[PDB]
């Protein structure tokens, strides 16, 4: 039986107000926030949780402002409203930038995405763990008021004819939901079900943030400059609460009184592994991308997956019967190329203007620089032998260093010869690259070491950007930029194929996944795929894509049976395993091979 | 762009207007047919909007359908 008052937050910070008649006003002493506005707390702990739109980011801190920590710091965009889940000790949040409703748990672990699919622009959101449903506010072009299972289940939309509503608080107790209406500039309640929709008052100036505690509804108007109080059935008793209050966004009413109530998630976190959401009792939830084992209760990563970033971002995606989400990779300017290791399961890209190329897990937490300053250009993993291939667009090389750092040295050079794309294939011995000669492009073929140098194709190019292969069915493919077209052709150079001419506007990144051939497409703004079932769609909409590359399960055994697999076959340099089946080893254009026929 | 930071409504491209969103102006999407656009009660209500709407469009006209308003011709 402790004290009940009211929390609000000003954009500069959050503010804590007695429902006294005319009490004091202190803030909640936070660091660091700039633009404030979705708030709500946790009882049990004592914990205060909010919204900074200007950073960006959901933290959380104690009342008495210790243990600040940013509980999301990536993927958003206007997180406008956010509600907590006590009993599954879960958080709760809509972007309406991104269109999003996620989850995660209360510290930021396991996030996920609830609902995103035919979605406008979620603002509030209130949650009602105890019956296992989440309500909330939609905004854009035809706002209405739907309602969901914890889980994201049984989406509907529960008030249909509504302007855009705000305050979006549950009676836990009456069972009756009460929101402002901006465009209509009146408060309205209903119950659970949507129907029985009663206005309780009519002629406010310019409402925006509420909340009901016992037989009160609380709002802050802007016109009014005010908090103001009435009754949550007549709209009569009207006072004010708080005066000369210069913007006052949303606002709660603190007390154990409304963090009540019991569900299966509150014992244990009901056995589940990551994630424990509510339904109209639980079911075990996962984070984004992994998927849910037979046992209803334990969760498994992702095997085979998506990758492709844009300027500025990583982004992940599976190709399932069922959305993409942001890596969490901080220092990211102008990505360039990407790439992926499965052995160590590491990320590596190449950003432009900083000239160097990088690595880091999925996760962002392993972050180490491979090359620094010359600049580079694309870039491809000799996933055995443990080297990368790259390009310099400024000294106009193929450069070969170690996953570590260490140099290996380079392969080819020569003036005249402007190396740009390049894909690998170590299980047949030969490089496929993008020659960008002045005035006459091509597409180039040679052994890992620069030997065996040929022309595959010098007609019918432009810009060819991209290259990928699919060493299983023994193919190539190339995007050119200029001529707006996918080819493919035997690695050999025979059987030249155009496959799409039609729809394109700027392929710049290419992936083979399974039997199908994914393309970015920069101006046009979408991924596309296409059956080597037709050319479909896979996301429109995206902002600035860069490059893609698809990443499938290695299996161990299987990797190992490759003859570099192991200690790269002797070779001090290069392994090349040729012809029949063996390895050979062979140098780099500054060493030429000894005696032992291992080292140089 | 939209979703770009704008202060003048030809900073904005084709389809678009400056709108501002918080304590900023981004390039927000023009109204189109039946989507609900604001009528200020008091005038005034327009300077305090945080959470500005575009207007209407290209042949469009910010009408009825306590009721609201949409974007009809």
Redesign the interface.
Same mark, same amino acid.
Not at chain 2, 66 to 69: A, D, E, G, Q
């Given at each position: 039986v402790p004290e009940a008052f009211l929390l609000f937050s000003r954009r500069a910070d959050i503010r804590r107000i007695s429902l006294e008649t005319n009490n004091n006003n202190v803030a909640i002493p936070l660091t660091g926030v700039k633009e404030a506005s979705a708030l709500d707390f946790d009882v049990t702990d004592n914990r205060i949780y909010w919204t900074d739109i200007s950073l960006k980011t959901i933290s959380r801190a104690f009342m008495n402002g210790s243990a600040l920590e940013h509980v999301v710091e990536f993927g958003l965009d206007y997180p406008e409203g956010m509600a907590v889940d006590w009993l599954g000790k879960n958080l709760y949040w809509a972007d309406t930038g991104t269109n999003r409703i996620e989850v995660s748990k209360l510290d930021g672990q396991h996030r996920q995405v609830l609902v995103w699919k035919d979605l406008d622009s979620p603002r509030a959101l209130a949650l009602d763990p105890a019956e296992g449903f989440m309500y909330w506010t939609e905004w854009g072009g035809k706002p209405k008021i739907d309602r969901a299972a914890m889980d994201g289940s049984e989406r509907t939309t529960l008030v249909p004819n509504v302007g855009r509503a705000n305050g979006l608080t549950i009676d836990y107790a009456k069972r009756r939901l009460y929101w402002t209406d901006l465009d209509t500039n009146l408060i309205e309640s209903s119950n659970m079900l949507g129907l029985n929709r009663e206005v309780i008052a009519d002629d406010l100036p310019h409402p925006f943030g509420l909340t009901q505690y016992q037989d009160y509804i609380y709002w802050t108007d802007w016109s009014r400059r005010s908090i103001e109080r009435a009754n949550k059935t007549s709209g009569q008793n009207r006072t004010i609460i708080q005066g000369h209050l210069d913007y006052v966004m949303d606002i709660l009413v603190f007390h154990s009184s409304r963090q009540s109530g019991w569900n299966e998630c509150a014992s244990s976190n009901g056995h589940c592994s990551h994630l424990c959401l509510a339904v109209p009792g639980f079911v075990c939830g996962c984070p984004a991308h992994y998927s849910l084992n037979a046992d209803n209760r334990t969760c498994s990563a992702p095997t085979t997956f998506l990758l492709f970033s844009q300027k500025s971002a990583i982004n992940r995606m599976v190709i399932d019967e069922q959305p993409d989400i942001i890596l969490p990779i901080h220092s990211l300017r102008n990505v360039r190329a990407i790439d992926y290791d499965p052995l160590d399961k590491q990320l590596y890209w190449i950003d432009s203007r900083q000239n160097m190329i990088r690595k880091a897990q999925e996760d962002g937490s392993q972050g180490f620089t491979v090359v620094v300053s010359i600049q580079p250009y694309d870039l491809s993993i000799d996933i055995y032998s443990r080297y990368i291939y790259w390009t310099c667009e400024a000294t106009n090389v193929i450069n070969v260093t170690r996953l570590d750092g260490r140099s290996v040295g380079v392969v080819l050079k020569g003036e005249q010869d402007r190396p740009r794309a390049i894909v690998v294939n170590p299980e047949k011995g030969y490089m496929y690259f993008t020659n960008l000669q002045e005035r006459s492009p091509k597409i180039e073929r040679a052994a890992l070491d620069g030997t065996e140098r040929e022309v595959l194709f010098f007609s019918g190019l432009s810009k060819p950007i991209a290259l990928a292969l699919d060493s299983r069915l023994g193919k190539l493919f190339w995007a050119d930029s200029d001529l707006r077209r996918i080819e493919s052709s035997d690695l050999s150079g025979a059987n030249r194929i155009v496959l799409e001419d039609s729809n394109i506007l700027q392929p710049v990144g290419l992936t083979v996944f399974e039997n199908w051939l994914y393309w970015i497409d920069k101006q046009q703004q979408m991924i596309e795929k296409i059956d080597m079932e037709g050319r479909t769609k896979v996301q429109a909409r995206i902002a600035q894509l860069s490059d893609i590359h698809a990443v499938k399960e290695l299996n161990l055994q299987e990797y190992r049976q490759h003859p570099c697999a192991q200690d790269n076959g002797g070779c001090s340099h290069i392994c090349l395993v040729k012809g029949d089946g063996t390895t050979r080893c062979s140098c780099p254009m500054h060493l030429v091979l000894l005696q032992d026929e291992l080292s140089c | 762009q939209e979703?770009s930071v704008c202060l003048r409504s030809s900073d904005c491209a084709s389809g678009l207007c400056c709108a501002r969103?918080?304590?900023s102006k981004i390039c927000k999407p023009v109204?189109?047919e039946?989507?609900?656009c604001?009528?200020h %009660? %008091?005038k005034? !209500?327009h300077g305090?909007e945080?959470?500005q709407r575009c207007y209407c469009g290209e042949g469009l006209s910010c009408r009825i359908q !306590? %009721?609201?308003?949409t974007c009809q011709r």
């Open positions: - | 979703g969103h918080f304590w109204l189109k039946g989507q609900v604001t009528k %009660r %008091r005034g !209500s305090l945080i959470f !306590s %009721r609201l308003h």
